[PDB]
Scaffold this active site. Structure first.
Site, PDB file in Angstrom:
ATOM      1  N   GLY E  55     -10.428   2.169  28.709  1.00  0.00           N
ATOM      2  CA  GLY E  55     -11.069   3.336  29.278  1.00  0.00           C
ATOM      3  C   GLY E  55     -11.765   3.004  30.580  1.00  0.00           C
ATOM      4  O   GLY E  55     -11.788   1.863  31.029  1.00  0.00           O
ATOM      5  N   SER E  84     -10.397  -3.751  27.050  1.00  0.00           N
ATOM      6  CA  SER E  84     -11.092  -3.338  28.275  1.00  0.00           C
ATOM      7  C   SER E  84     -12.472  -2.807  27.885  1.00  0.00           C
ATOM      8  O   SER E  84     -13.255  -3.566  27.289  1.00  0.00           O
ATOM      9  CB  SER E  84     -10.169  -2.384  29.038  1.00  0.00           C
ATOM     10  OG  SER E  84     -10.901  -1.495  29.849  1.00  0.00           O
ATOM     11  N   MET E  85     -12.817  -1.542  28.159  1.00  0.00           N
ATOM     12  CA  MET E  85     -14.159  -1.080  27.807  1.00  0.00           C
ATOM     13  C   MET E  85     -14.374  -1.020  26.300  1.00  0.00           C
ATOM     14  O   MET E  85     -15.523  -1.008  25.854  1.00  0.00           O
ATOM     15  CB  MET E  85     -14.460   0.286  28.442  1.00  0.00           C
ATOM     16  CG  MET E  85     -14.703   0.229  29.959  1.00  0.00           C
ATOM     17  SD  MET E  85     -15.816  -1.094  30.499  1.00  0.00           S
ATOM     18  CE  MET E  85     -17.446  -0.427  30.131  1.00  0.00           C
ATOM     19  N   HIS E 109      -9.907  -7.049  30.463  1.00  0.00           N
ATOM     20  CA  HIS E 109      -9.152  -6.309  31.461  1.00  0.00           C
ATOM     21  C   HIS E 109     -10.117  -5.789  32.515  1.00  0.00           C
ATOM     22  O   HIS E 109     -11.276  -5.495  32.213  1.00  0.00           O
ATOM     23  CB  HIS E 109      -8.379  -5.150  30.812  1.00  0.00           C
ATOM     24  CG  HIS E 109      -7.657  -4.272  31.786  1.00  0.00           C
ATOM     25  ND1 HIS E 109      -6.508  -4.671  32.437  1.00  0.00           N
ATOM     26  CD2 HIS E 109      -7.911  -3.011  32.210  1.00  0.00           C
ATOM     27  CE1 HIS E 109      -6.093  -3.696  33.227  1.00  0.00           C
ATOM     28  NE2 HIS E 109      -6.929  -2.679  33.110  1.00  0.00           N
ATOM     29  N   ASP E 156      -5.850 -10.465  32.075  1.00  0.00           N
ATOM     30  CA  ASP E 156      -5.686  -9.728  30.823  1.00  0.00           C
ATOM     31  C   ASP E 156      -5.639 -10.674  29.622  1.00  0.00           C
ATOM     32  O   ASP E 156      -4.802 -10.531  28.732  1.00  0.00           O
ATOM     33  CB  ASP E 156      -4.436  -8.843  30.859  1.00  0.00           C
ATOM     34  CG  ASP E 156      -4.576  -7.655  31.804  1.00  0.00           C
ATOM     35  OD1 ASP E 156      -5.673  -7.059  31.893  1.00  0.00           O
ATOM     36  OD2 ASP E 156      -3.573  -7.310  32.453  1.00  0.00           O
TER      37      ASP E 156
END
Lengths: 192, 193, 188, 192, 190, 190, 191, 190, 192, 188
Positions: E55, E84-85, E109, E156
């Protein structure tokens, strides 16, 4: 449960019914059901039918009219904004003495469509039905208003329309109501 | 729980059911369910079936009819605006003595769609079913009205229609109801409970 | 029964109603229904009509106005943001002495443009347009020809100018709760 | 109610209001209505307005602001993520002393749409209104922050933005809030 | 509907579910739920289950600030993916109460960069500042140097549950919830 | 014309027409029109009807069949991919001696199960008549007894090219078109 | 033109027109226009009207019929698949001696029941009654059958094979294959 | 498409077709065709075939003014229905060259009344003026008194072809076009 | 090309242009392009602009007008049905002496939309432009008709409209044309 | 091949092209293609670019501009109605001496707002925005800081003001056909 429907439902509990749109089969079923429900809940108290309607099919209007008569209750009618075609008819069909126009109401006489197109008979059978119900509509409008049937028919043919004062003098309503009476001394308009 | 559905539900509590649309499989399921529900809730009290219906398929109307007969309670019927085709049939199928028309109701006879096209069978099998249920529709309409079956057929063939007075005369209903009686002196139309 | 409608229904219990959009037949039906309902529930208590509306149809607005007059109770009006055209008309139609503008409200005068043929519709439009002018003159105390001329050029007003012209009786800045100022429907 | 709306309604019971989208006419109506409702329920308790908004029209923001002032109770404001344009304005319009930024909130100044084109009036009339409300928006932002009106207008022209700490120094908020206090030590953020 | 009804009932257990991509709408929904649970009882833990593919930084940072605003501890559980988030919010849970399920995957990420009416230049300035804060806070959550956070994020880097435990995103792997008393209850032991 | 239509129009100039889809009323009208047009243009030259069709209605197929008979010129037919149901019927209806299958064509027999303003009883009368005539004609095309046609159609019997040749649907299997007048030219040697 | 339209236009050059769908106002306009065009191009050469139609409105059908009569050319008609309702009518309205059925064609009689009018349903019904009776009269004239037989057969949706249609009088001949050498009907394919 | 191609070819025969309701788009299309035919040859008749259920007065009056603008005679033919403004345009053809086909129906009607940005009052003023001109011109086309035109129009009086001939809408009934020379050629004799 | 477009293209070969809809930006581009094309093909022959238009934006009409003037040839105009708002303006802007009304054409004066809201500029900037082009529209209408600018503005304010004969007297057109002339007697209307 | 496109194609044969809408990637591709085509057909004859455009993307406009410079032939520009933002830029980019405004044209200066992340896109936007300012200063002869300040407040110009500021070289009222005035592309 949405806002508008919730307000209409609470108005139903005050025995107030709204005809606020074109008269079609769906609206007839909806209004017919409300008159039956109010009758069942209390057959001795008036129903108050407020009308702001641009017209409607003869067939659908006659179903509402028959249910108004079926109801043992008196039905007061109120021209709230427009009462055109079968909206005029249903206004004039209110219990005599309890038909009202608000001061800026407008009443329109008109030959509506039949609403007899819904079934799969040929146009000849539909035209037969249309001729009979149109003539009955003229006859009943003449009885509601006290005007000769020839007057009703000629005025309908030319789409004669009426201000509140003109509608009162012609006989569609019994009074122009300005503000509701609450202490007695006049029409309460269902607002007690 | 929208306004329309809410009013219909409250009428159901008064044992008043509405046939307000063309009769197809979905409407038949809907009406059958309401008749079963009201029968289960109280098998001794009349159901009041109000009809404003422009027509419907034979197959769907026959499912409603069989459920009307299945119900142990009487079913009063009321021609409220239009009772056409299987709407006329279901009106005439009311408990005899309890079939009513409002004074401006119209009744129209019609040879309707069979409703047999939903099967996976060929048209020959669908036509076999159609011929059987159409003949039985005529036979039952003759029994409801007292008319000869040959008159039922010929009048349905030509889309004969009736005012409320004419429908009483022909035999579809037993009485014309103008205003409901709250006094015992006459039919209450389901409004006196 | 979404959140927005729940809040409006709960405001109805405070006798507060909103005219928050363009006036058309749907809005008129909704607003008339609320006025009738509040009247039937208690015909002795004020109704509080908040207005943030860019205008609308004369015919629909006139039906709201007639229902305002029908109601036995006083209707206080509040110009919350914009009160334009029929929104101005209904603001000015409030019970005299109980018409209010919030401090940054704007009032705009405007001449709206308009089954039977066009001739019948034009005739009906003519009478309600004339009635709108006459009543606007009565609400404000201004000459009818001033209403017509000012409406014709879309004259607009700040809250203080609207007070001086006569659309409202007072500017409310904040509500008075203990009972010697306008409570704006919030003191119950 | 769906889940989202049910949670918002339960937050309303805690006198917590959410401004989580662009300020248009619809959002202003929804926000005004909630402020009026919370005022009517208890005019003596603060309302807590959480803000995560990318901007909005001047006219709609001014309607919300006038309703904030109409409310007899205080309105604490909290910059939860973004407070841009009229979102910054409503944040800065909170009851002085009760304007808060979360540590990673961002405040953005901007000269927005007036939202005055909904009327049927001439564009000249719309521009007259826009000039008046724009000037008043600058004057009020100057009053909220303690900055001179020239600085407000110049910074808005260049879309000047601020971290929470910079927003505190400039004057949009009174405190950065990191964690809510549970015993009258610091602000409770409406979670008391 | 049924789905919303199950989530509402889980709210009564102080369990909230981040099961999708983090955008503004999800941020508003989750922020609202954390505030509601905090107001209802500021002394009881909140249990935040995470199965999220990523996100926006802005939306995730609003949730993070609401987690820190809440006076309650917030336990976090990597239920399937935390990318990621989603990784960021997992690692942001109350230290000692961050958990991964045995087959959870954690992915680092760098999100790429816009709801304001300001030019792209102002939007990029904001992104730069929040991106650097995200790296700094990931470093503090995990105990890793900021340079390692940035380098691993740009490639990543992903982790099994045991790899994520060793790196510092979570404090424990939870296999089965303990109603014993011997172990975490995952919010399932009230 | 777009590309696809231009290619079909150019093939019309070679007297080549395609039945490439399910036989319905629209397809019957288009094929009937093409057969009339080619017949009018030159009633002495063969028409080449390539068939890759999964089936279709008896009524639409019989209108095409009647137009094939109407045409004064021979109609050579080619099972290009699939010739099922009325697609098989129309393949087998080609001028005897000029019915071909490509080596990997498949022929499927099938009974369609069956528009008017008349009721279903009149529709079923018409269907019974055309179904019986379709069985009768399939018998004449193939040389099989009517009862075998009926039974094989009832169970959806299908055929490879070689099996179709032996049953009687086609006269030859064509592998490569002949340019040198050796064998069948498939409409490609003008 | 797309493929289908291109083939229809090229058939127009062979004086062949195709009624392949339900007869409504749009189809009537299209067919009337093609008849006028072919008449203008050569008023001495037959037009060949191929019919595969499931029905249509009396008003639309009668407009086509009046244009068939207006045309100085003979109009040969061909029942190609179905000729029902006004499709039967237009088939039977072909130039006498030049009406044809293909061997598996089906002809169905039908009273088309039932309006784009601005006039009320009473005026529309008056018009329908007039054109319905005239349709029965002409169909009696085309077939040689009495009007009462036409009416009763239409009422019950009587249908015909090609052979029964020939015996009833809708068509003059069944064509199996077109003759290009003059030994029988050429069906417009012998040019 | 095919339809447009047939209409274009009929244009080369100076035949134009009013086959639908008269609205602004139809007015523009027909006006354009009359101007084009006038420019191509101002000495040759135009043949206007009418099968129209009605239309707006404004749109029909624009066509009428273009018919009068054209230096050519305009023959008119009631092909199926000529109702309301379709009747008006039929009766507006060059006198002596107005025709009805034997089963054509002609219907009189008063259309009801809006593309301007002026109020409904100005739109009604325009409608009143054009409505009165329409009645006056119908009276001149037919030879009937204006009072009879208005009375018959309000009751939707309709006419068979022979009734329309007697009333004055058309000059002749045409059964078959004459290539003889003895009779009208309907535009089909060039 | 479909039929409609093919007929318009064939009319272009006769130097006949059609303005048959509302004047917006798209229509102005299409009209300007046809005027430029006809000018380039033969700058010595008139263009014939037939008008049946319910109105349009000032900005789009002004672009067409400047292109009419740019054209080295004359532009005859013909009111074919309606010429309202910028449709009236373009009719009146025809080459003086070559402005025609058909006998039942109607000309309507109106103060229209500016069409200046497409820019990314502030509404204040849009209103500045609108005030300038509106005033210039009045001044040019006064020049076209010979009426004083005060009368143009007052009549436009009240949506004054005109029959063909009234339009001739007021000054929008130079002649009413009934039938086109085939031999230099009167106007040929481009059908020569 | 509708009527509108047929007319544009026939105008192309007169070496006339139109920028009649908002500048975006599609419009830029179309306009660049027309410039390349006209150049390849005859690199010695002027191209006539008519502009009635409310603005658009800097990036798309800059690509049109670079193609204008690439073309070996002169490009005359005509402000037909509006030339705003990148429409102004391309008007002012015409071959000096051959930039024209029609008498009621309006010119508006404006700062437009803006696979790799937002940082990369902002960097690219920065360089083309700076280039737009620098080149606008060169086209008009105005100081770069005046271009920036005037663009920042959406300064706009009538045809005569645009001539004085330096966006165009001449006002054309009507085209000159016999060859001692601008022919506007109409004299061939």
């Amino acid at each position: 449960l949405n806002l508008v429907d919730s307000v209409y439902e609470r108005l139903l509990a005050e025995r107030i019914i709204f005809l606020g749109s074109q008269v079609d089969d769906d609206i007839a079923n909806r209004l017919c059901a409300q008159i039956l429900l109010l009758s069942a809940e209390d057959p001795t108290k008036d129903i108050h039918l407020y009308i702001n309607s641009p017209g409607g099919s003869i067939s659908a209007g006659m179903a509402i009219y028959d249910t108004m008569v079926l109801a043992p209750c008196d039905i007061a009618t109120y021209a709230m904004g427009m009462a055109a075609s079968m909206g005029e008819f249903l206004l004039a069909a209110g219990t005599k003495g309890k038909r009202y126009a608000l001061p800026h109401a407008r009443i329109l006489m008109h030959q509506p469509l039949g609403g007899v197109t819904g079934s799969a008979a040929d146009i000849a059978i539909q035209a037969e039905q249309f001729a009979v119900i149109k003539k009955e509509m003229f006859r009943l409008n003449a009885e509601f208003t006290g005007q000769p049937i020839e007057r009703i028919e000629a005025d309908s043919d030319r789409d004669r329309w009426f201000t509140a004062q003109e509608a009162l003098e012609y006989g569609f309503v019994d009074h122009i109501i300005t503000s509701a009476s609450v202490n007695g001394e006049g029409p309460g308009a269902g607002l007690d």
